[PDB]
């Protein structure tokens, strides 16, 4: 395990967190070494759960880095998006039970993430909040993520939600369905573990073929057409109106 | 704008209101004149939404008129089914952000307008009810109808609704999400300009692409087999025991 | 009527009592006895609806009984299946309005009966607990049991309860929406007759379209592959791996 931009740490149970300050964005990089540490956590038949989490509290993921694709050539673009889309593919798929244990803000890609566990958990802090706020940013959410959206909080709120960027507040979060459970920030963890307790109790064949059935659907109506997914982001992320509003945002950000 | 059927009135927010009483049925000048209105509104770049009305307080639609479809000819019904899906593409593909002041009854066709806006609001008087109660016309709701409103208030829910062809006051429309707010009757039109005004803050072009991404897959449903569609109503509405049913219940109407 | 394995007694309502003590559990005379008398009743002019329920209160339905599917040669096996196929498409696409009167516990195949009905009502006894627990008898759903259950609470519930098998008590499986009213245990069978008794003001036509257009999908999903799903069935139970917790489940019951 590289343990640069995320750390693996440690009974079947791993914490994979994320060390890329100071909004743990998801570059390149990053989006390189965690798929593949999440793959040795994979075949590693002593690991069957994975927590994933900031290990700095705060901010659990702002999501991609806007710099990751700008002013930037066609193939990088295309590199880039499918390693976005490789990391979703990669969690949404996976055998291992994931458990995020939401400890800060976690917008768009941050959210993305939270969307492909099988459990989600966040911290009562009014501060932090979670959601797809693309829209906002000039962007969409990639059709794919979308319908992991609304498998999770239903269509029309996902419908509103998306339109308008929201971003959920713990309390509104759970009463969503985005998140599962809220407790104090201190206890975040714990509950990941004891939660994490609990589907381990489940016998891992049975868990992982249900699971699989629940998802192959959504995952494989992107895995049929990725090429042209990659295509279609280059494309519209390479128009210079895109690519403008790209740089007001960005500039904004000072 | 005609101005006759349905009233087009003015910063980037324009009414239509609904003019056509007694009930608001939805007549075929209706149809044609809202469409033609509509289309006026999306290519006029001063106006990002819209908001729908009655222009009479009490009956918000009654729906289609069942007069249109008894003792007419085939050409007539092909004429005029092809009317309401497109009334229907038109409200539910529009680019505009579109919002339902509901300040009266909305039963069947009324019903269908509200489902294809993007935020619903409704007045808390107990008299207003809204909802698909096609099957107890001995009718019932096409296809695409229906998952327009399994995308709003649940698979179960509608299954439900729709066989009993359930009618929702104010309360138990707000609690199936059938509505999205409900306020005091003269509030219904304050309210629909403030979420409006939310809604404007969301720059266009990406909130167009989220709603655009969210119906495709319901519209192209429809788009795809619309002859077949059309060929369907006409055979199904032309039958002598279900034009017979359409006597029984017209005559009960006197 | 065979009368032996399911009692179907009796203005328009038929009742369907499940007489395979200690546990109603789905045997293949069961489910042979279920179809054949469930097809003289749909069409049986006079009966519009049925009520399903345990003539023994206490147990609903332990669903498949695990003996039927142990040691057995292929063909069985695909017999087996295409049994369980068939009582599931038949209640599933009924034109008859079913009403499951749930007075007992009712997991995994017995909730299967419930979910095909179009209302579930369940007696306050907090040891009665409905859901589908396959995951944890080292089992799976099968794809169209499963879609019936997102169909029921959502996909997120479903995603969960699946994996964790999740047995809801009456309360909590009311809270899902995998029931639709909870009354007290000796009320039960008289509020299936209240309600059945609105269902029937419903013009049986169109309520049975609506109905009909509801599930055709769900349906449909399985029937263009049910070949493919019996083969499945019959490669994966018999699995030497498979086999073996079938039999270490079933000593474990002694
Ligand atoms: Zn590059
Ligand atoms: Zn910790
Ligand atoms: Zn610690
Ligand atoms: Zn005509
Ligand atoms: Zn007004
Ligand atoms: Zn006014
Ligand atoms: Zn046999
Ligand atoms: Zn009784
Ligand atoms: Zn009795």
């Avoid at 343990?3 to 994320?18: C, D, P, Q, T």
Wanted: with cysteine.
């Amino acid at each position: 395990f590289s343990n640069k931009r995320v750390l693996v740490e440690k009974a079947g149970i791993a914490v994979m967190k994320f060390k890329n300050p100071p909004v743990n964005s998801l570059s390149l990089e990053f989006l390189t070494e965690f798929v593949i540490s999440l793959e040795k956590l994979e075949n590693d038949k002593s690991i069957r759960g994975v927590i994933l989490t900031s290990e700095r509290p705060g901010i659990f993921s702002a999501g991609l880095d806007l710099m990751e694709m700008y002013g930037r050539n066609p193939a990088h673009y295309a590199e880039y998006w499918k390693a976005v889309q490789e990391l979703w593919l990669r969690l949404y798929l996976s055998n291992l039970t994931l458990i995020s244990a939401i400890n800060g803000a976690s917008p768009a890609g941050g959210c993305l993430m939270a969307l492909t566990c099988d459990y989600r958990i966040m911290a009562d802090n009014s501060k932090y909040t979670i959601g797809l706020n693309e829209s906002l940013l000039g962007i969409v959410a990639p059709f794919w993520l979308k319908d992991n959206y609304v498998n999770t909080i239903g269509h029309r709120a996902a419908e509103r939600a998306l339109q308008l960027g929201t971003l959920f507040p713990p309390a509104e979060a759970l009463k969503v369905g985005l998140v599962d459970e809220v407790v104090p920030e201190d206890q975040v963890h714990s509950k990941a573990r004891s939660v994490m307790a609990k589907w381990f109790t489940i016998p891992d064949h049975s868990r992982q073929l249900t699971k699989s059935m629940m998802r192959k659907a959504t995952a494989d109506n992107l895995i049929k057409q990725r090429e042209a997914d990659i295509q279609n982001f280059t494309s519209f992320i390479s128009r210079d109106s895109i690519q403008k509003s790209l740089h007001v945002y960005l500039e904004k950000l000072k």
